[PDB]
């Protein structure tokens, strides 16, 4: 079903980015806000808005270069069938340090570049390539 | 401070003794999936106060029999 809504979130981003869609909407949650707000601060997307309180609806503004996909590919890493965890020195890089890896720790959701100054490890969410 | 386990009781038919099952999450050495592993211990039950399905706290003691090596501390929740 919708057992991995983060994988459902990454499905809706990769489709609309490739099919030249201007903006998408999706059901919101606390975890989907904490990931899209990081992608807004890392130049991958443009803006996010929330709509509705009894039915929380998250919106994302897409981003293009000259009509080209900014987010070329994104890869869900951990999953409910197999959980993935790393330490503070085993955090993997994406495209040898070009792409970022979204890792949620006890100090909130940050990147692997931001986790070096934080010195923590935890759950890998997605490889933002 | 001392070494202390917690679990649940699966068998209580015998006198002065109960069977407490211990579950633990194990990263698989080849695949990494967290798997529930059942550890079945034999715990000395003084006065036979533990029933079935009771969450219970146990500690370590000397071997009192051929199979027993654990004793009772207190019952966390009884007869829910």
């Amino acid at each position: 079903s919708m057992q991995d809504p983060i994988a459902d979130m990454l499905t809706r981003i990769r489709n609309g980015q490739a099919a030249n869609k201007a903006a998408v909407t999706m059901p919101s949650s606390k975890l989907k806000v904490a990931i899209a707000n990081v992608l807004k601060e890392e130049g991958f997307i443009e803006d996010f808005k929330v709509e509705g309180d009894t039915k929380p609806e998250l919106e994302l503004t897409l981003k293009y270069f000259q009509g080209k996909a900014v987010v070329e590919s994104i890869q869900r890493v951990s999953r409910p069938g197999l959980r993935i965890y790393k330490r503070k020195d085993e955090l993997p890089k994406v495209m040898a340090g070009l792409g970022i890896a979204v890792v949620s720790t006890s100090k909130g959701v940050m990147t692997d570049r931001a986790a070096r100054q934080a010195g923590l490890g935890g759950e890998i969410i997605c490889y933002v390539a | 401070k001392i070494r202390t386990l917690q679990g649940r009781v699966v068998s209580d038919k015998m006198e002065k003794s109960i069977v407490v099952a211990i579950e633990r999450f194990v990263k698989h050495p080849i695949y990494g999936k967290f798997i529930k592993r059942t550890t079945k211990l034999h715990v000395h039950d003084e006065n036979n106060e533990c029933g079935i399905g009771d969450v219970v706290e146990i500690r370590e003691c000397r071997p009192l029999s051929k199979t027993k090596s654990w004793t009772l501390v207190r019952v966390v929740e009884k007869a829910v």
Binding site: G81, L82 | H28, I30, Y31, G32, K33, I35
Partner: peptide, 14 residues
Amino acid sequence: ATVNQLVRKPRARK
């Protein structure tokens, strides 16, 4: 292909 399938029985080496 499923990891949870290989929990019951691993890949059979010939």
